[PDB]
Design a protein around this ligand. Structure first.
Ligand SMILES: [Mg+2]
Ligand SMILES: [Mg+2]
Ligand SMILES: [Mg+2]
Ligand SMILES: [Mg+2]
Ligand SMILES: [Zn+2]
Lengths: 64, 225, 129, 102, 267
RNA sequence: CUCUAACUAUAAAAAUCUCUCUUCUC
């Protein structure tokens, strides 16, 4: 199937990664806005973007 | 991970077509006597399933048998001994605590006292019972430790041992379990040692079982329904 | 009870290749054993949360096909003389098991803890790294 | 010279204690020079509390915790970030690091 | 032209061991032509390249040469393959080389046929390849049988009689292989007269030299007499030499001398 | 002048180095 979902960031949890070029945010789904994940982004983001995720069970883990 | 050096030293089917469900029936000493279901291979004339069920030990939370949640941290093992057809009957096999509660009460700055006793009940059933108690900080103890001297610990162990011997030798595990559910033995043990030491969290954990006389048919059918 | 057919999830999460192994109440009957290394390529991301996620999805699908709708979690670490701390994957395995429709009842930790027995592997000075 | 008047052991009147093994590297180290950390946590993190609560029978389950006392070695304790090097005037203090949260 | 994969499907299967010719490398991984199957590229990930730690990409990749490979995931809508090279066992590479060699021999033979007949290789495979693989399981084994037994081409429709005739010409010219069954007999005779007995045993052994299997007694030293046979079926020469052993023992025992066996008939 | 709560969690490899050292008084 094609379970492409969207998620609007509500807050950005700093920038992580050994490179220092990836960031970590807290995304909340367009549906069921009380259900949120923490996810890693590779690019410039701010409060308001809408990420596209092919997963929903995944949660971000700090990259070292 | 397909990697397999095939160091082997299709005739495939679905094993679930040749299987079915039996029902677990709890002793009448518990309220919610409908425990659950068990998956079993289909009956065969050469190898009857009814032989295969007997000896099974199901492990169920005590609160799942009485509805309440005061018995949340206990756990009871039932033994499958007699199968009535599409429904089987289970006798008591053992009792235990949940590790979560046990680690929750085993805390620092207090001495845990363990009493261990192997006895014979009113019938020929032979049991082993473990009791665990913890010294209690008094409601006025400005001293922050709550340790107990070795003499107090030995006296407490003696009292708990004699109480357990009394309360096992005077009843059967039918009555003994009907007594374990309202944990009146815990209260009796705590009260009998009120003068020696406070003894918070007097509990009876891991009621074991070591022997069974022959089969005990009549009481087994009498214990159900 | 509304006839929630129960099983025990019985997750086993070592520091490598977590296990998800659902059984009936008795435990003598084993169904849907699919593990963490069952579904990953790197031979070492078996302990990774994604491996446990995939294994949990597979067992959920299998047991839902079976008829069991609710499961009992029995988290086990590697136990014994080893670290006996829960593996990284088993947590995600439990989360994915709770995700896929299955109902959850009586989470327990059943790790085997010893009475300081059977001297630990490694020598007196232990693993030097 | 004496870096520690307590010698780090914290024995002072025993001569010998029974050693314990490290949880990471399995170092046979005396039980008092075996810096101990009592990890008490939830069996399900705050990341999955909502998911478990929504998808669990027995409404308002107690959600039991997990308890483990970790017996680290000292090399791992320095390396696995459990314990940190301190100023020689800060080594005096033995109180835990000021109540992580109130 | 070179196309038309040997096996059942142009796209690959699941977990099928594959057989790669690397073309170039990008940053992500290696896109590699697949020679076991028809032409479709596979992606070998960098993290899944080398058994050892990755240190020299070009030392191991060897752009322009062939190697072993294993398929992990497949795409059955447009065509994509995920491949690994780290997870190849020590023994599987041997069966990989033999499968490569036989499939490549078949490919070369049928490409020769197609180039001579100027018909696309796919059509010639339609008339020859997979009905043969259905009959025998391997086109090369069936080719060897057609070298021996010509009933292989029975029940199949070729595009023209010339195709089968020239295929037979090529297979007889190139796929020509007889195993030397050699045995050693020690004549420990000490009797009065053995040269006459040796000659009689010679005649008895050599008279049974059949039209297709000629058994000859070669002489090298006094005790060691070599027995040589060209076994085409490899299951008849041993009986021929056993009969020769019976004959020589019968000749030798009655005269007075003795004979001993040193090397029985073996391939 | 009145209180006992929150929590995690990485260990790839890295050997060696030759000169030559020079005052402080109003
Ligand atoms: Mg080190
Ligand atoms: Mg020093
Ligand atoms: Mg210390
Ligand atoms: Mg002294
Ligand atoms: Zn250590």
């Amino acid at each position: 199937k094609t379970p492409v979902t969207l998620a609007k960031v509500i807050k950005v949890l700093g920038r992580t990664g050994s490179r220092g070029g990836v960031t970590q945010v807290r995304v909340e789904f367009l549906e069921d806005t009380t259900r949120t994940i923490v996810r890693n982004v590779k690019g410039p983001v701010r409060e308001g973007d809408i990420l596209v995720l092919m997963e929903s069970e995944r949660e971000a883990r700090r990259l070292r | 991970a397909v990697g397999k050096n095939k160091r082997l030293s299709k005739r495939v089917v679905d094993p679930f077509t040749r299987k079915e469900w039996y029902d677990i029936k709890a002793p009448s000493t518990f309220e919610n006597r409908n425990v659950g279901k068990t998956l079993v291979n289909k009956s065969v004339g050469l190898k009857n399933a009814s032989d295969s069920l007997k000896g099974r030990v199901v492990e169920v939370c005590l609160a799942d048998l009485q509805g309440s949640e005061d018995h949340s941290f206990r756990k009871v093992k039932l033994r499958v001994d007699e199968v009535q057809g599409k429904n089987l009957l289970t006798n008591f096999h053992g009792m235990d605590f949940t590790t979560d509660k046990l680690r929750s009460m085993v805390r620092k700055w207090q001495t845990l006292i363990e009493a261990n006793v192997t006895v014979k009940t009113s019938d020929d059933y032979v049991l082993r019972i473990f009791a665990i108690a913890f010294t209690r900080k008094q409601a006025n103890q400005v001293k922050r430790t709550s340790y107990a001297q070795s003499s107090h610990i030995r006296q407490i162990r003696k009292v708990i041992s004699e109480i357990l011997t009394r309360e096992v030798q005077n009843s059967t595990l039918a009555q003994l379990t009907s007594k374990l559910i309202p944990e009146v033995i815990n209260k009796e043990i705590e009260n009998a040692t009120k003068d020696i030491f406070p003894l918070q969290n007097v509990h009876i954990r891991k009621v074991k079982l070591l022997k069974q006389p022959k089969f005990d048919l009549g009481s087994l059918l009498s214990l159900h329904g | 009870d509304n006839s929630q057919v129960f099983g025990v999830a019985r997750i086993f999460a070592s520091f490598n290749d977590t296990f998800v192994h659902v059984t009936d109440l008795s435990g003598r009957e084993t169904i849907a054993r699919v593990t963490g290394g069952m579904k990953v390529k790197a031979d070492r991301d078996e302990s990774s949360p994604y491996a446990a996620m995939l294994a949990a999805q597979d067992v959920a699908a299998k047991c839902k096909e079976v008829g069991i709708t609710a499961v009992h979690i029995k988290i086990r670490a590697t136990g014994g003389t080893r670290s006996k701390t829960p593996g990284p994957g088993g947590q995600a395995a439990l989360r994915a098991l709770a995700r896929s429709g299955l109902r959850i009842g009586r989470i327990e930790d059943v790790t085997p803890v010893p009475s300081d027995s059977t001297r630990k592997k490694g020598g007196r000075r232990g693993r030097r790294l | 010279p004496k870096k520690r008047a307590s010698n780090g052991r914290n024995k002072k009147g025993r001569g010998h204690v029974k050693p314990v093994r490290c949880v990471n590297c399995s170092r046979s180290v005396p039980k008092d020079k075996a810096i101990k950390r009592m990890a008490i946590r939830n069996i399900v993190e705050a990341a999955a509390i909502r998911d478990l609560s929504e998808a669990s029978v027995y409404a308002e389950y107690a959600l039991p915790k997990t308890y483990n006392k970790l017996h680290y070695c000292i090399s791992c304790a320095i390396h696995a970030r459990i314990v940190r090097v301190r100023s020689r005037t800060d080594r005096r203090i033995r109180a835990p690091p000021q109540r992580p949260r109130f | 032209t070179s196309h038309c994969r040997f096996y059942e499907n142009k796209y690959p299967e699941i977990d099928d061991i594959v057989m790669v010719n690397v073309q170039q490398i990008a940053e992500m991984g290696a896109y590699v032509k697949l020679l076991e199957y028809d032409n479709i590229e596979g992606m070998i990930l960098l993290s899944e390249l080398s058994r050892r730690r990755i240190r020299s990409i070009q030392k191991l990749i060897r752009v322009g040469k062939n190697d072993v490979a294993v398929v992990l995931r497949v795409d059955k809508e447009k065509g994509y393959i995920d491949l690994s090279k780290r997870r190849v066992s020590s023994e599987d590479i041997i069966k990989c080389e033999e499968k490569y060699q036989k499939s490549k021999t078949v490919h070369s033979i049928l490409r020769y046929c197609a180039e001579k007949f100027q018909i696309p290789l796919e059509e010639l495979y339609k008339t020859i390849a997979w009905p043969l693989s259905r009959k025998f399981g391997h086109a090369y084994e069936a080719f060897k049988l057609s070298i021996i037994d010509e009933t292989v081409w029975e029940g199949i429709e070729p595009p023209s009689k010339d195709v089968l005739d020239e295929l037979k010409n090529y297979i007889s010219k190139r796929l020509t292989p007889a195993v030397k069954i050699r045995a050693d007999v020690e004549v420990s005779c000490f009797s009065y007269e053995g040269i006459d007995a040796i000659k009689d045993a010679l005649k008895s052994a050599e008279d049974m030299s059949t039209e297709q299997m000629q058994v000859k007694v070669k002489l090298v030293a006094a005790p060691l007499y070599v027995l040589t046979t060209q076994a085409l079926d490899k299951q008849k020469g041993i009986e021929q030499l056993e009969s020769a052993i019976e004959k020589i023992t019968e000749v030798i025992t009655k005269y007075g001398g003795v004979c001993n066996i040193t090397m029985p008939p073996k391939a």
